[PDB]
Amino acid sequence: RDHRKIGKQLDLYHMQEEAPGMVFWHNDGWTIFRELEVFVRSKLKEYQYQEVKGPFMMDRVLWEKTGHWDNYKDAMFTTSSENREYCIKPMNCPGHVQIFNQGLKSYRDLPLRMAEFGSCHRNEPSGSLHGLMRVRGFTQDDAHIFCTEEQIRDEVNGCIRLVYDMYSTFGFEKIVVKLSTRPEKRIGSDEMWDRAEADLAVALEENNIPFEYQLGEGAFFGPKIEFTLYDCLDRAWQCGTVQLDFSLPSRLSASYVGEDNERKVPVMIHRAILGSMERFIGILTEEFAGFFPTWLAPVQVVIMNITDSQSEYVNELTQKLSNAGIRVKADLRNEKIGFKIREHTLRRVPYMLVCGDKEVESGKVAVRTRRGKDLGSMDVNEVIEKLQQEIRSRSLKQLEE
Amino acid sequence: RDHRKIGKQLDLYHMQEEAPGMVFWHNDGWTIFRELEVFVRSKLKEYQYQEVKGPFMMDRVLWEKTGHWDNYKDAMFTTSSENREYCIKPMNCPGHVQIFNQGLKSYRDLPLRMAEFGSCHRNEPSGSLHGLMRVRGFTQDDAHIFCTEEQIRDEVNGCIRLVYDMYSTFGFEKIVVKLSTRPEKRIGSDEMWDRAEADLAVALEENNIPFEYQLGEGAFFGPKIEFTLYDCLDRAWQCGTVQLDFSLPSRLSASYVGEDNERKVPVMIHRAILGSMERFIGILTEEFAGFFPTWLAPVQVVIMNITDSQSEYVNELTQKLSNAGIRVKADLRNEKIGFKIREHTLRRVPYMLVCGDKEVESGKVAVRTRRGKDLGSMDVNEVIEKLQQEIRSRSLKQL
Ligand SMILES: Nc1ncnc2c1ncn2[C@@H]1O[C@H](COP(=O)(O)OP(=O)(O)OP(=O)(O)O)[C@@H](O)[C@H]1O
Ligand SMILES: Nc1ncnc2c1ncn2[C@@H]1O[C@H](COP(=O)(O)OP(=O)(O)OP(=O)(O)O)[C@@H](O)[C@H]1O
Ligand SMILES: [Mg+2]
Ligand SMILES: [Mg+2]
Ligand SMILES: [Mg+2]
Ligand SMILES: [Mg+2]
Ligand SMILES: [Zn+2]
Ligand SMILES: [Zn+2]
């Protein structure tokens, strides 16, 4: 049930000591990663987010200005060029503010929602590293919303709504919500912290979401709503996060022209829905025990012959399913079909299509699933249509399941 | 036609002194980048490439094994953690070999084609930096092909075919090819360099490609075919490249079980088709003067109302085009229609749809282009279909 064991069995990724906490994504794990990006992007479109890309590193001077240097230096990787020191970014917020700061902004531009699949590096103590769930290089499905104070309620509500909308696709039954309050080391006044923490609490109450406080776990610049998911040992992992920030835009000289023609500082909401792709894939792997929903499955269909007699027909069906957009592979090896089926079951391939002479003559396929079910013979075109529907709806459940 | 001025005018990206040579991709520039990735991914499905992702940093010891720490040192960003030294990767090859080395490989797995949109960082001298063309952090449409000696000819041919295939989509008329031979600092024996250089020259001749030698410009591990594209000032920029490598696989302990059941070392072909996304976008921006073909345009369609009476219709049209897969925006601002049209024309939006009362009553739309052509009233579904055909085919010219 451990995602590290399942990841090896399905050849999803590996890690090695030449790059501690750094993931090597193999083809099949990168397929899952990419499908999750496509899913997130479909939500970015619906909820009207920009998508940007900030640089990997920036001058230490800028990280000093935010307060990251004093409050985050231990976790930061640094490098140098031509007598200047750079920080590899542990967070995407300063880069998004650099983009916001190009060009004059008006209240008419707000709320401005700016998303990034943002690569973060944090020098986590090597003793704390754990598979995909705690790594040193990870990719957040991050975004920063620049808004007015009057827009905070609506924008925080929109993030909360987005979290439950995305999580319902995966069928999560245990989502534990925490409000992380001010940490001992922080910037911003007590009055600003009281306001930000109340805003989050009222937003959760308004959505009728039960939660508990988590004292001292907020960011150095603002409080957080945390959406907690659980692994196979029922350990709590922080995934989704909504953060309210009255401090960083001021520190980074962000402003916009208000209705009054006065210069104003935007509020910034930070949020990640999945958290990081790495930690979320870890959670999905354990939650599903490697039985990824068909739309996520690295290989959705394997087509297999009984003998070389049906090998041409298998090759035609494989091209046909591939042209219909299905991740399909042919298994033409000189092995018994029971052997093949057991192997692709261990690989958690949703569907196995067996082609005997009966199947070749009729243009049909015998359908087996990774759950051990025999689904009988079906017409090829009906199978394709059913798989396409299963994939496009991102269905959690297989045919006749 | 300088891509840096166009990039500012169209809000594609920016750069600043807090990160020399590092691009901040804005929404519209990042849209072009992502469409190029979609295009590349479509071609690699066709040619049966895997797609992977390696880590950003690995131990200095690994870069010593490859010979990079000695042949590539001062060009590399280095960092530390818990008394170990790491290199931010300047190339993707060692990571791809690490993935190849996971699990027993046989001749049945070859050729194994492994692609990555590989983020590279190189400490280029700050005085050499230029716009998007020469940056310190960039993304290569990289791949490594592991193959046998007998498979070299076919695999190099496939890379050359891929370059001309993908470049024809953009209509490039000037593609100059170079063969870069052994540099002063290299790994691998002279006989291996003789054979690698001959293999690439034969490949170019067999593909009917006139080329010029570039003595001493090969990679430290092997010679390269370089595909050169030219900017507005006719400066030469290396974009696509094919590199033949008989030495890195052995240094990194790559092997496969041959048909005879003995251990053998694969040959590696390195190749990038576009080169880097940053540099290729720079070239495209100058080549098209910011009039990106519709399939690449950050915003493909803007729909505007003349008065508030049509605002509802414009919103229904906008949702309909967006559901048909078109990058479309509604412009409902309290501005004169002639102000709105000019704004989106200057932003080089391919198609502008104007809705007055007669368009609403008829279920039609008045269509004009960024070049000033007035297409008149058209049926909505006719516009969507023509737009979809222009995008699906990645057509260079409009309606
Ligand atoms: N080391 C890490 N490995 C993997 N994912 C991470 C890591 N650190 C953070 N994330 C993910 O990024 C999200 C947003 O980042 P944030 O700065 O809020 O995390 P965090 O509070 O430091 O997390 P944690 O308490 O788990 O260390 C987290 O909710 C988590 O999903
Ligand atoms: N500093 C850079 N900025 C942008 N793109 C680059 C840069 N260096 C290399 N590339 C791109 O990556 C491709 C493959 O990398 P490779 O190591 O072969 O380049 P290169 O020979 O060092 O390039 P150049 O001669 O332009 O310095 C190049 O052909 C080019 O398109
Ligand atoms: Mg942390
Ligand atoms: Mg935390
Ligand atoms: Mg170079
Ligand atoms: Mg060169
Ligand atoms: Zn942030
Ligand atoms: Zn390489």
Author numbering:
A (entry chain A): 242 to 642
B (entry chain B): 242 to 640
The authors write:
Aminoacyl-tRNA synthetases (AARSs), a family of essential protein synthesis enzymes, are attractive targets for drug development. OB contains a β-lactone ring with a 2,3-dihydroxybenzamidyl moiety attached to the α position and a 4-nitrobenzyl moiety attached to the β position. When ThrRS catalyzes tRNA aminoacylation, the Zn2+ ion recognizes and binds l-threonine, assisting in the l-threonine activation reaction.
As a result, in the TSA experiment, OB only increased the Tm of ThrRS_Y462F by 2.6 °C, while 36j still increased the Tm of ThrRS_Y462F by 29.7 °C. Consistently, OB failed to inhibit the activity of ThrRS_Y462F in the ATP hydrolysis assay up to 5 μM. Without the binding of OB, the conformation of Tyr313 of ThrRS_Y462F was in a position that would clash with OB as it was in the ThrRS-OB complexes.
